[PDB]
């Protein structure tokens, strides 16, 4: 009977919810109990689909949100159509102008330490790795932020906006923590 559960359900529209119910049931994690993880998965599908909004029409392949062996069949298709190492670890997505896939990471430390951490969990050099903050902060991989400027700010808007959110209900510090 979590509070933070209906705070996450009236944040994020049905969709949002309904896949990370999908993603963390199949990773056997129960939404209902750890809900923090669950506004964490919200929060970095919504981001990644804002992110995927900002290029043209054809120029991300969206890798998170699938099932995770469909997921793996469209990273399989993209690397024998394009001729890329298959990353060793699930990306987020697949830029098409620039060649590579892309990982996403929203934290609640700040930048550094989470670009640090993903970066040496892949170590394959290949992928694109970019980071956003509850703060407003932003970081890619060989500062190739990759979207326009505007996009990334209206990411970070959002993202202060649900850190406001949580904060005037008293759930932000315990998101911080975890
Ligand atoms: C309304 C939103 C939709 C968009 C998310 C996303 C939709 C789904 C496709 C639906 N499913 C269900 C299973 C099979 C399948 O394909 N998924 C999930 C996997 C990848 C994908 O595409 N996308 C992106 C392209 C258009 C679209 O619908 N979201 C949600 C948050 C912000 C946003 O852009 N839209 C559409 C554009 C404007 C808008 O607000
Ligand atoms: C391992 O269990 C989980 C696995 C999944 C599906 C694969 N997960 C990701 O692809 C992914 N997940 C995260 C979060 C914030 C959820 N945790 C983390 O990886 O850090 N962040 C990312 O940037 C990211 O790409 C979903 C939920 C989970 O709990
Ligand atoms: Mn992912
Ligand atoms: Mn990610």
Redesign the pocket.
């Known amino acids: 009977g979590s509070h933070m559960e209906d705070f996450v359900r009236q944040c994020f529209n049905p969709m949002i919810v309904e896949l990370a119910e999908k ?2 049931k199949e ?1 056997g ?1 129960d939404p209902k109990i750890e809900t923090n ?1 669950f506004a ?2 919200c929060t ?1 599908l919504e981001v990644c689909f804002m992110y995927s909004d900002g290029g043209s029409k054809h120029r991300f392949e969206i890798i ?1 949100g699938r099932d995770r062996i469909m997921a793996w069949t469209v990273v399989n298709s993209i690397c024998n159509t394009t001729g890329v190492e298959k990353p060793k670890f ?1 990306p ?1 997505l697949y830029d098409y102008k620039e060649n590579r896939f892309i ?3 929203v934290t609640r430390r700040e930048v550094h330490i989470y670009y640090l951490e993903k970066a040496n969990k892949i170590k394959s050099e290949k992928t694109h790795i970019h980071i956003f903050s509850f703060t407003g902060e932003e970081m890619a991989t060989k500062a190739d932020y990759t979207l326009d400027e505007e996009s990334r700010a209206r990411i970070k808007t959002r993202l202060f906006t649900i850190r406001q959110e949580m904060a005037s209900r008293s759930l932000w510090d315990s998101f911080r923590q975890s």
Do not use: Q, R, S, T
């Open positions: 993603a963390m990773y994690e993880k964490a998965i970095h998170e699930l987020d990982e996403i990471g």
